[PDB]
Each structure stands twice: as C-alpha cells, then as structure tokens.
Amino acid sequence: EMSEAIPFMPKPANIDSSMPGYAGFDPLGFTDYYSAKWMQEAEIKHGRVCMLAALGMVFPEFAKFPQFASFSTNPLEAFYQVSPAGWGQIFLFIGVLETFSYEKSFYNFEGGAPGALGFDPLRMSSNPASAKQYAAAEVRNGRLAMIGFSGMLHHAIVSKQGPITQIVEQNFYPK
Amino acid sequence: GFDPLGLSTLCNVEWLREAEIKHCRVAMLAAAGSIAQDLYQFPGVEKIVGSAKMTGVHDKILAAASTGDYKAQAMSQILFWTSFLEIVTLPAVFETMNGGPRKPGVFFFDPLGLGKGDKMGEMELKEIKNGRLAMIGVGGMVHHYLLTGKGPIQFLSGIP
Amino acid sequence: DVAGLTPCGESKEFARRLDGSVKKLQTRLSKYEAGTPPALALQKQIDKTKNRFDRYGKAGLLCGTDGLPHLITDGRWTHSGEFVIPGLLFLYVAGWIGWVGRSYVLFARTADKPTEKEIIIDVPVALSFVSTGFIWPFSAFKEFTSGNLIVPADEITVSPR
Amino acid sequence: DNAMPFLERPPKLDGSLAGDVGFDPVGFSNYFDLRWLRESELKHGRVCMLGVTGLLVQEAVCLPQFSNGKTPVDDFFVVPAAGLWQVFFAIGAVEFFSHGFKLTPGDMFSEGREAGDFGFDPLGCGKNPDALARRRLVEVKNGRLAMIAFGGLLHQQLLTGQGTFEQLANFKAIA
Amino acid sequence: VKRGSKVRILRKESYWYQDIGTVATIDTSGIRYPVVVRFEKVSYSGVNTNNFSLDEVVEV
Ligand code: CLA
Ligand code: CLA
Ligand code: CLA
Ligand code: CLA
Ligand SMILES: CC1=C(C#C/C(C)=C/C=C/C(C)=C/C=C/C=C(C)/C=C/C=C(\C)C#CC2=C(C)C[C@@H](O)CC2(C)C)C(C)(C)C[C@H](O)C1
Ligand SMILES: CC1=C(C#C/C(C)=C/C=C/C(C)=C/C=C/C=C(C)/C=C/C=C(\C)C#CC2=C(C)C[C@@H](O)CC2(C)C)C(C)(C)C[C@H](O)C1
Ligand SMILES: CC1=C(C#C/C(C)=C/C=C/C(C)=C/C=C/C=C(C)/C=C/C=C(\C)C#CC2=C(C)C[C@@H](O)CC2(C)C)C(C)(C)C[C@H](O)C1
Ligand SMILES: CCCCCCCCCCCCO[C@@H]1O[C@H](CO)[C@@H](O[C@H]2O[C@H](CO)[C@@H](O)[C@H](O)[C@H]2O)[C@H](O)[C@H]1O
C-alpha cells in the first residue's frame, strides 16, 4: 500500500479514507504517535478558527461596525485599539463555546465524529451526498483558511496595512 | 411548528419556553403601559415628568433620581421588587429543567380562579399569542418613539 | 534607543574608545622607522582597529554609557543577529553532532565487539554518518514519531527506589 | 459528423445530447461529469441570451428611477449598490430553490435530475416530443452563439465607449 | 523458562533490573535460585552472570 498524496511513500497506517479530508498525507508520522481522532478534532477546530479569522482580516476593509468606525483597517493595530473589557467579553464568549468542546473531548471522547459539536441548526447534512460534500468542503476550506490567514498575518506585519489595501496600493514587497 | 432556524436544538426547550413566556408577559405590561400612560396620568406626575413619552420617562425620572430627589425613586423601587421576585422564584426554573412537576410558566397564580373554573385548554394559547404580539408591538412603539416624538395614540392618530 | 541605549555610530564614548585605541598604537609606532617590520605590523594593527570600530558603528549595535556595544536578546527582530540567528546556527550544528554520534553508537551496538568500535573507530562508516547530519531535524523527528527515539520506561534500568 | 476529423472522437461524447458534433479536443468529459458540464453550458448560454438582450435594450431604454450610463456596460455603475445587492440575492434565491439546495457537483445530481431541466414550460412549447428535441438543439446553439456574441458586445462597448448600434452607425477603426 | 531464551530481570536489587539477559542453564534440584542468566554489561563488581528465581525472570 502506498500514499496517494506522496506516491513513492508507504501509506500512513493510522489515517484512513473514512476521514473527510484524507489524502494519505502524513510524511512525518504524527498519527503513528498521537491519537488520530485528537488530531482530527484539533485540525477541524483550527480550521474553523482560521475560517473566521481570514474573513475577519478581510471584512473591515469593506465596512466597520459603527462603534469601531474610527478603528484602523490594518488588523494588527485594530487589535490594540479595542478595550480590554471588549477582549474580556470575547474571551468569555469563546470560553462558553469551548465548554461544549471541553465536555466533548476529555469525557465522551469516543462518542461521535470529529468536530461534531451538535451545531446543525439549519438541518443540513441530512442528505448523505450533501453530508459527504459538506464534510470534505469544511476540511478543505479550513486548511485553505489556515494558509490564507498565516499569509495575511505576516503580510500585515511587513506592509503595515490590511490585505485588500496592500493589494490595491500594490505594496507587494518590503519597502 | 414555526422554528425554521432550528434554535431549539441550540438550547434546552424548557429554558427557552419559560424565557418566551416571561418575555411575553413583561412585554404585555410594557405595551399596555405605554398606551395607558398616554390615556391616563397618575396624579402629581406632570411636575416630575412633564410630557415625556415612554422611554423618555425612564431617562427623565432617573435623571431626577440622580440628584437626591425623594419623589423620583420609582425606577429603583420597580427594579428592587422585580429583582426580589426574580430572586425568590429563581429555583422554579431550575426545578422544571431537573424534571420537576411544575410546567414552564405556571406559578399557580389563579386568585380569581377564572382559568381553574373552565378547563384551561385555550387560555394558555390566548396568553402565548397575545404576548408574542406584545413583544413585537413594544418593539414597534419604542423604535417609532426613537424616530418621532409621538406615543401610541399620537402616532396612530395621524400619518407622518 | 532600546533600554536607554545609544546607537554606537553616534555615541561619543565609542568614538573616544576608537581614538584612545589608535593613540595607544601610534605611540608604539613612534619608536620605529618607516620600512621596518615593527612599523609595518603596527600600521596593519591601526588599520584593523579602525576597520573594526567603523564596522561596529554601521552595524546597528547599541553602545552603553561606557561606549561598549551591548546585545539585546529579548526576541525583537531588529536585534536577531546578536542572539537569535547565531543561536539557530548553533542548534543546527549541535543537533548535527548529536544525531551523528547517536547514529554511530547504534551502529556500534550491532558490531562483533561493540566496545572495540568506540576506541578504534570505523572511519568509512563514521564518515558515512557525519555526512547524514544535514537533515537531522527531519530525521530525528521522524525517528521520534516512529517510536524509535524514546525507549519505554520498562526497558531502562533504575535504582531500587 | 466529427467536428475535428484529424482528432479521434472523444469516447464519452455519444450523440444523445443535442448539439453534439463531437467537439472536445482539450479533453473534458474524460475528467468531469458530462451532466455537470451540460448544466453549466445551458446555464452560461441562457444567461448570455438574457445578457445580449439586456445590452441591446439598455442602449435604448432606461427606467425613470435610474440614471443612464454612457454605455449599457456603464449602466452597471449608475444603479445604486443596494439595488445590485438585491438583484444578486434574488438570483441566489432562484439558484437555491431551482436546484433544491444541492448546488455542488457532488450532490446536484443525486435526485436523478436531468441536465438543463428545471420543469419550466408555462406556455407548453415542449408538449410535442420531436418538436422538443429540435428546440433542445436550437437552445444549445443559440446559447453558444449568445456566449460569443455577449463577449464581443461587452468588449467592443468597453473599447469604443459607444454602444452597439451607435457604434455600427458610426464605425471607427483602431488608430 | 528455557536455555538460550532472552529474559527481562525483575529483581529490584539486581544490577540488571529491567535489562535483558540470556538463560544459561536451569537447575532441577531444590535450588532457591535455579535460573542462570548472563549479561553483556558487567556489574560494578565486574561479574556478568547471576542466579535468579523463575518469579524474578520474565521472557521477552
Ligand atoms: C421583498 C421584496 C422587496 C422589497 C421590500 C424591496 C425593497 C427595496 N428595494 Mg427592491 N428588489 C427586490 C425585492 C424587494 N426590494 C427583488 C426581489 C429585486 C431583484 C429582482 C429587487 C431589485 C431592486 C433594485 C434594482 C433596486 C431595489 C431597491 C430597493 C429599496 C429602496 C430604498 C432606497 O432608495 O433607500 C434605501 C437606501 C439604502 C442605502 C439602504 C439599503 C437598502 C435596504 C437594505 C433594502 C433592503 C431590502 C431587503 C433586503 C429585501 C431584499 C431581499 C432580496 C432577496 C432581494 C427598497 C427597500 C433600490 C435600492 O435599494 O436603491 C438604493 C434599487 O435600485 N430593489
Ligand atoms: C414593563 C412595564 C413597565 C414599566 C417599566 C413602567 C415604568 C413606568 N411607568 Mg408605566 N405602566 C405599566 C407598566 C410599566 N410601567 C403598566 C402595565 C401600566 C398599567 C396599564 C402602567 C401605567 C402607568 C401610568 C398610568 C403611569 C406609569 C408611569 C411609569 C413610571 C413611574 C412608575 C409608576 O408609577 O408606574 C405605575 C404603574 C402601574 C401602577 C402599573 C402596575 C401594574 C402591575 C405591574 C400589574 C400587576 C398585576 C398582577 C396582579 C401582579 C402579578 C404578580 C406576579 C408576577 C407574582 C415608570 C417609568 C407613570 C409616569 O411617570 O408616566 C408619565 C404614570 O403616570 N405607568
Ligand atoms: C555523541 C554522543 C552523545 C550524545 C548524543 C549525548 C546526549 C546527551 N547527553 Mg551526553 N555525553 C557524551 C556523549 C553524548 N551525549 C560524552 C562523550 C560524555 C562524556 C564527556 C557525555 C557526558 C554527559 C553528561 C555529564 C551529561 C550529558 C547529558 C546529555 C543530554 C543533554 C545534552 C547535553 O547536556 O549535552 C552535554 C554533552 C556533554 C557534557 C559532552 C559531549 C561531548 C561531545 C561534544 C559529544 C560526543 C562526541 C562523540 C565523540 C561523537 C562521535 C561521533 C562519530 C563517532 C561519528 C543528552 C541525553 C546531560 C544530561 O543527562 O541531561 C539530561 C548531562 O548532564 N552527557
Ligand atoms: C474572427 C475573429 C477576429 C476578431 C474579432 C478580430 C479582431 C481584431 N483584429 Mg484580428 N485577425 C483574425 C481574426 C479576428 N480579429 C484572424 C483570423 C487573423 C489572421 C491571422 C487576424 C489578423 C489581424 C491583423 C494582422 C490585425 C488584426 C486586427 C484586429 C483588430 C481590428 C480592429 C479594428 O478597428 O479593425 C476594423 C477593421 C475592419 C472592420 C476591416 C477588416 C477587414 C480586413 C482588413 C480584411 C482581411 C482579409 C484577409 C485577407 C482574410 C484572410 C484570412 C486568413 C489569412 C486567416 C481587432 C482587435 C488589427 C489590429 O490589432 O490593429 C490594432 C490588425 O492589424 N487582426
Ligand atoms: C456551521 C453551520 C452553518 C454555518 C456557518 C459559517 C459562519 C460559515 C463560515 C465560513 C467561512 C467564514 C469560510 C471562510 C473561509 C476563508 C478562506 C478559505 C480564505 C482563505 C484566504 C486565502 C486563501 C487568501 C489569501 C491572500 C494572501 C495570503 C495574500 C494577500 O495579499 C492576498 C490573498 C487574499 C490572496 C449554518 C449557520 C448555515 C447552519 C448549519 O446547520 C451549520
Ligand atoms: C395573570 C393574572 C392576573 C393579571 C394580570 C395582568 C397584569 C394582565 C395584563 C395583560 C396585558 C398587560 C396585556 C397587553 C398586551 C399588549 C399588546 C398585545 C400590544 C400590542 C401592540 C401592537 C401590536 C402595536 C402597535 C403600534 C401603535 C398602536 C403605536 C405606534 O407608536 C407603534 C405601532 C404602530 C407599532 C389577574 C390579576 C387578572 C388574576 C388572574 O388569575 C392571573
Ligand atoms: C424557457 C421558457 C421560455 C423562455 C424564454 C427566453 C427569455 C428566451 C430568450 C431568448 C433570447 C434572448 C435569445 C437571444 C439570442 C442572441 C443571440 C443568439 C446573439 C445574437 C448576436 C450576434 C450573433 C452578434 C453580434 C455582434 C458583435 C458580437 C459585436 C457588434 O459590434 C457587431 C454584432 C452586432 C454583429 C418561455 C417563458 C417563453 C416559456 C417556455 O415554455 C419556457
Ligand atoms: C504569490 C506568492 C506565493 C507564496 C509567496 C510567499 C513568499 C514566502 C516568503 C518569501 C518572502 C518574500 O520575499 C520578500 O519579497 C521580495 C522578493 O524579492 C523582496 O523585496 C525586494 O525585491 C522586490 C522585487 O523587486 C523589490 O520591489 C523590493 O523593494 C525589495 O525589498 C524581499 O527582500 C523579500 O524578503
């Protein structure tokens, strides 16, 4: 058996086609040492955080909330312009959301599917084909958003602006 | 059967049901109170409030209370008694969730026993529908005041 | 600048360090004739001293009140060439030496007399190992995750308590 | 016949679809679903038929509540932004309801849907079968023609800046 | 155990506690420590052999 992503290497033993974003890609064998299901929960949660984060790096280029209308469009400056009461409320809300994941992992670890936090209000994924397409699409858009946010962050460090402003002004290289 | 956004999957149905009935009753009081405030004015209030309408009365009485005025502590007193009532009826909403005998919204408050006399198979739905309207109507009333100084009767009477 | 320090290119005490260091050499040069080997040697030293001070002045080092260059090591990127980048170079060489020595010790265990391989080194095999060290981070991490770097606690001899 | 006689006929292009002249040189339908590709071809075609009608009409007609651009492509830039956003979401709502909320290649055809079909015949023009077959081929060819024609009209209107009919009545070569 | 087998020592006061030796012979008499085990490391005394009881020795 051989890896599909890397055709000359053997298949990583602890990943499987059942997992939505499977490509056979584990060259440094993290799953041979760590739990494959813990890695999947971590990958899915990192992906959701980076999906929101990539949208958040781009969105105040277009429009800002009226309260923060004076705040900067470079996100790394708007990070410090927010008051600590605001960041405390953000941290508390994320903490409330993370209680459900703290209860999912560490207590009923083996009951369910990775990333299944019981959040399906619009009742999608009922159709099996739709469920497959959405599972793989969530994984791939999460990975893409991870790469995209990492880029956009370091670009905001170099050019002291946001993504769109940087592109429009063609500030593509260190001045 | 109205729940298109599936928000009852995101919380306990019992907590949501009691919260809905409480919102409906409080809003019933707010909507009825605003219409009554225009129609009738309890004695003496015209010197403390002038001619301020629904939301303006809150800010103006609390402005007078922000000075040391004895005759302006209505807001603190209503806040106190509603807070006291919510503190002592607080274990009820946790008993319902724990599987308790009492249903959402029932405090067994039937002095006249009008609900107890006839079978109460409709008065429940009467309250729920009237209160759902009361919430939306309060919303209307407050934001229309926030645009035009008219109250219930003034805004309904003409058409700006 | 950082921590109340002064860039060495405009600190006046760095300038006095350079001037005193050159006067110390010139008074020794004043006792020799022009084409002699001691005169040539001292002039080479004067040029070397001037070159060192000039280079330090234009390098972004931060002199103190003493006028001696100071190193900032808190992690800021404007001063990464003073500890962070030399440190990355060190850890690469040190991890290379460790990975290569470990690979030879594991080879020597599978030998006819394992203790003869360590006082009389198999130089072709040991040079084969010294060449492999250039990709030690990947080789050592793959070694770790494949359960071949760390041995379990029950194959290790311990004291009674 | 074969559209490109020197090339071998593509293996998946049987004559069952209308408009089939055996023209797939690059190599699609050997990688993608022909059902999806045919749905994309009819969708592109109908949008471009409506687009060519819109370009010709907007050169003459203008609603009283809207300003008038220099060209029908400049008509986009004088209609209020909120109007464009309402049109975008109305088209999105139609796309959601017509496909039954299955829009991805993976799930769009899990209900045995027929490519290009949305059950739309109020006038009953497709009541007759043989007439329906002829109108299928007519549709695919008029859609292909409007695709090329829309490309031409839009780029010439951008270049000259003088419409379509006023351009023809005042033809001026590149100098 | 058997002769020529590899064993993990479980005597906590052994020099070779939790290391592997090889079984030399096994006595059949009423011996308290009938299993003879040889090791490749020498102890602090320079001995590389020792007697152990079955309970003290586990096969690997
Ligand atoms: C549900 C039915 C409905 C309703 C009530 C409206 C209401 C409105 N439309 Mg219409 N519209 C609809 C469906 C509807 N639209 C559909 C289905 C289409 C496409 C076929 C359009 C295409 C359309 C165009 C092309 C234009 C409008 C415009 C307008 C607004 C003008 C207000 C103004 O000038 O200052 C308001 C000024 C603002 C800056 C505030 C922004 C406008 C708010 C947000 C409108 C909200 C409408 C709401 C989201 C419903 C749309 C749902 C969506 C699926 C279409 C008005 C509120 C005009 C407009 O907005 O110009 C400004 C305009 O040019 N509409
Ligand atoms: C959310 C509800 C709400 C709020 C915050 C206010 C707040 C206010 N009102 Mg309005 N009001 C309300 C409801 C409300 N009212 C209702 C329901 C009515 C009767 C229809 C009125 C009639 C009213 C008048 C006529 C006047 C005010 C005035 C005022 C102000 C001074 C307080 C006062 O004298 O109230 C007086 C309010 C009452 C006497 C109504 C009490 C009704 C209670 C709650 C019914 C309870 C029935 C039931 C048996 C209890 C069940 C208990 C169970 C839960 C255990 C203050 C801003 C005065 C003011 O400054 O206006 C300019 C004024 O003149 N209000
Ligand atoms: C290449 C062989 C090698 C390897 C991989 C290690 C690895 C380690 N040693 Mg050991 N060590 C070695 C040789 C080696 N040592 C030798 C030869 C000596 C005798 C001087 C020691 C004496 C020693 C002590 C006293 C300590 C360690 C400690 C450690 C650990 C932390 C790193 C450190 O503190 O370095 C420290 C390194 C030294 C003190 C000496 C290293 C001497 C040279 C530079 C390395 C040997 C080169 C070797 C000849 C390679 C030839 C390769 C060729 C045949 C291909 C780590 C487990 C420490 C520990 O237990 O921490 C948890 C500790 O306290 N080591
Ligand atoms: C069918 C698609 C097509 C389209 C849309 C265009 C579009 C254009 N061509 Mg291109 N062209 C095409 C096919 C096409 N060409 C082909 C197949 C060739 C052969 C390789 C050329 C060779 C060509 C050259 C060499 C030039 C253009 C130029 C132009 C521009 C003319 C703009 C203008 O004002 O002219 C208005 C002009 C007319 C309406 C007159 C057209 C009549 C011509 C002169 C007759 C030529 C007949 C010819 C012998 C036919 C033999 C065919 C065979 C050799 C392939 C425009 C961008 C010109 C350009 O870019 O200038 C800036 C230019 O100099 N074209
Ligand atoms: C969960 C769920 C539902 C839901 C939901 C929600 C809220 C879903 C949210 C989904 C989101 C926000 C997805 C966003 C993904 C962003 C990506 C992939 C961006 C990548 C950026 C890139 C690649 C880049 C870049 C860049 C680089 C680095 C350099 C730059 O100079 C330029 C450039 C821009 C090119 C609902 C509510 C319907 C109910 C349902 O029952 C269950
Ligand atoms: C429970 C119980 C007891 C009790 C009790 C109590 C306190 C009973 C009270 C019941 C109440 C207070 C009912 C009030 C409902 C108000 C509604 C539905 C208004 C909707 C407004 C709308 C739609 C509007 C509007 C519009 C207008 C006109 C104005 C515009 O500017 C705005 C707008 C255009 C939006 C008793 C003592 C009987 C014993 C019994 O044993 C148990
Ligand atoms: C489906 C359905 C129905 C329907 C329907 C509908 C809406 C049908 C709509 C049909 C339409 C709008 C067809 C439009 C076709 C346009 C074409 C082929 C392009 C022509 C231009 C060319 C070639 C050109 C050009 C040019 C270029 C590029 C540049 C210029 O400088 C020069 C030049 C001008 C020469 C109904 C409701 C009837 C009922 C039915 O039961 C079901
Ligand atoms: C589309 C790219 C996809 C992946 C890109 C991610 C890049 C990964 C990190 C690479 C860092 C980019 O590399 C960085 O940019 C350019 C590339 O010459 C250099 O910038 C330099 O050359 C450019 C190009 O003319 C000059 O305009 C600029 O004034 C000069 O500083 C920087 O010195 C270098 O630090």
Coordinates of C-alpha atoms and ligand atoms in Angstrom, one line a residue, chain B residues 26 29-30 32-33 36-37 40-42 45 49 57 61 74-75 78 85 109, ligand 2:
Chain B
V26 CA -43.1 41.7 30.5
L29 CA -47.0 45.1 30.6
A30 CA -44.8 47.4 28.5
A32 CA -50.3 48.1 27.7
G33 CA -48.5 50.5 30.0
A36 CA -52.3 53.6 29.3
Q37 CA -49.6 56.2 30.1
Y40 CA -54.3 58.4 31.8
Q41 CA -51.6 60.1 34.0
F42 CA -51.4 59.1 37.7
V45 CA -46.5 63.0 37.8
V49 CA -42.0 64.0 34.1
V57 CA -40.0 58.8 31.2
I61 CA -37.2 60.0 36.3
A74 CA -39.8 54.9 41.1
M75 CA -37.2 53.1 38.9
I78 CA -39.7 48.8 40.5
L85 CA -39.4 38.4 42.8
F109 CA -51.2 32.2 40.3
Ligands
CLA2 C1 -42.5 46.8 31.9 C2 -43.5 47.5 32.4 C3 -43.5 48.9 32.9 C4 -42.5 49.8 33.2 C5 -41.0 49.7 33.4 C6 -43.2 51.0 33.7 C7 -42.5 52.1 34.2 C8 -43.1 53.3 34.5 N1 -44.3 53.7 34.3 MG1 -45.8 52.5 33.4 N2 -47.4 51.2 33.3 C9 -47.2 49.8 33.1 C10 -46.0 49.1 33.0 C11 -44.8 49.7 33.1 N3 -44.5 51.0 33.6 C12 -48.5 49.2 33.1 C13 -48.6 47.7 33.0 C14 -49.4 50.1 33.4 C15 -50.9 50.0 33.5 C16 -51.6 49.7 32.2 C17 -48.7 51.4 33.5 C18 -49.4 52.6 33.7 C19 -48.6 53.7 34.0 C20 -49.2 55.1 34.3 C21 -50.6 55.4 34.2 C22 -48.1 55.8 34.7 C23 -46.9 55.0 34.6 C24 -45.7 55.6 35.0 C25 -44.5 55.0 34.9 C26 -43.2 55.4 35.6 C27 -43.2 55.5 37.1 C28 -43.7 54.2 37.8 C29 -45.2 54.2 38.0 O1 -45.9 54.9 38.7 O2 -45.8 53.1 37.4 C30 -47.2 53.0 37.7 C31 -47.6 51.7 37.1 C32 -48.6 50.9 37.5 C33 -49.4 51.3 38.6 C34 -48.9 49.6 36.8 C35 -48.6 48.4 37.7 C36 -49.2 47.2 37.1 C37 -48.8 45.9 37.7 C38 -47.4 45.5 37.3 C39 -49.8 44.9 37.4 C40 -49.6 43.6 38.2 C41 -50.8 42.7 38.2 C42 -50.6 41.3 38.9 C43 -51.7 41.1 40.0 C44 -49.2 41.1 39.5 C45 -48.7 39.7 39.3 C46 -47.6 39.3 40.3 C47 -46.9 38.0 39.9 C48 -45.8 38.2 38.9 C49 -46.4 37.4 41.2 C50 -42.2 54.4 35.1 C51 -41.2 54.8 34.0 C52 -46.1 57.0 35.4 C53 -45.3 58.0 34.7 O3 -44.3 58.6 35.2 O4 -45.8 58.3 33.5 C54 -45.5 59.6 32.9 C55 -47.6 57.1 35.1 O5 -48.2 58.2 35.2 N4 -47.2 53.8 34.1

